[PDB]
Design a protein around this ligand. Structure first.
Ligand SMILES: *[C@@H]1O[C@H](CO)[C@@H](O)[C@H](O)[C@H]1NC(C)=O
Lengths: 49, 50
């Protein structure tokens, strides 16, 4: 819930909401979509594959 | 959750650490100091305190 005058929103870097069209507005959250690294388990190349 | 930063959960979770501490307490109460230097040797606690 944002006071009905602001347009952008952020707490550290960016979490902006509200559609910036003068015709209409709609609160849309901003967040990544589960980025991450990948790790591989291997008992050893000279014992299995 | 920010961009580019992630936190790795600890390998040894809370329950296992609690179990380790409980095992240490049980050993030091029911066996004195003999469990840290070989097999656990039972001994009554008043005798261990003396
Ligand atoms: C894997 O095991 C074999 C058989 O003991 C050995 O000859 C080899 O040096 C080991 N290491 C690799 C990288 O193959």
């Amino acid at each position: 819930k944002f006071l009905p005058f602001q347009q952008f929103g952020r707490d550290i870097a960016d979490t902006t909401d509200a559609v910036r069209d003068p015709q209409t507005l709609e609160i849309l959250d901003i967040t990544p979509c589960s980025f991450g690294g990948v790790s591989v388990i291997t008992p050893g190349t000279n014992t299995s594959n | 959750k920010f961009n580019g930063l992630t936190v790795l959960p600890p390998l040894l979770t809370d329950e296992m650490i609690a179990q380790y501490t409980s095992a240490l307490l049980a050993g030091t109460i029911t066996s004195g100091w003999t469990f840290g230097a070989g097999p656990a040797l039972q001994i009554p606690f008043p005798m261990q305190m003396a």
